[PDB]
């Protein structure tokens, strides 16, 4: 189904997301969910968390024709170089944009949609996206790296957004 997506100033956007148990029908339930739901959105990337499922799932598509799916259970980082920036979305904080800074490169090790271990080294939109979503299964969200004022101007703009 499209899943409920939570925005700011909801206290569960907040929770550390635990790691998953089993890579199970359930989970492989939650993933093809989350798809549904980041595209009905018009997204590039969803964490569970966003959606109220506090476990470590995370799903993202970069591409023009929106046929490339990569799902990341369990994400570890595993190095990251550069330095970068855009003026990035969220949809947990909608119609706000702002450039925050990020590494230019990153390698992460993950579990697939499967079960299955895999590697991926990223750079572009697609390291900066997994930058985003990663930083949502610790409770993290990109008005974080702006200043005080700026996270509450950001905050009583969606939020006047009835
Ligand atoms: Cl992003
Ligand atoms: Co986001």
């Given at each position: 189904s499209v899943l409920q997506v939570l925005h700011i100033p909801?206290?569960?956007?907040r929770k550390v997301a635990k790691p998953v148990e089993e890579v199970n029908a359930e989970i492989q339930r939650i993933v093809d969910d989350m798809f549904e739901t980041m595209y009905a959105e018009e997204g590039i990337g969803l964490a569970a968390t966003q959606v109220?499922?506090?476990?470590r799932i995370i799903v993202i598509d970069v591409s023009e024709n929106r046929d490339e799916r990569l799902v990341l259970i369990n994400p570890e980082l595993l190095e990251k170089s550069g330095e970068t920036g855009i003026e990035e979305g969220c949809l947990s904080i909608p119609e706000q944009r702002a450039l925050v800074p990020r590494a230019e490169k990153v390698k992460i090790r993950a579990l697939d949609r499967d079960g299955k271990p895999f590697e991926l080294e990223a750079d572009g939109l697609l390291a900066i996206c997994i930058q985003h979503e990663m930083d949502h299964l610790v409770?993290?969200?990109?008005?974080?790296?702006?200043?005080p004022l700026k996270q509450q101007r950001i905050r009583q703009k969606v939020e006047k957004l009835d």
């Open positions: 909801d206290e569960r956007l109220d499922i506090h476990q409770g993290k969200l990109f008005m974080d790296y702006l200043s």
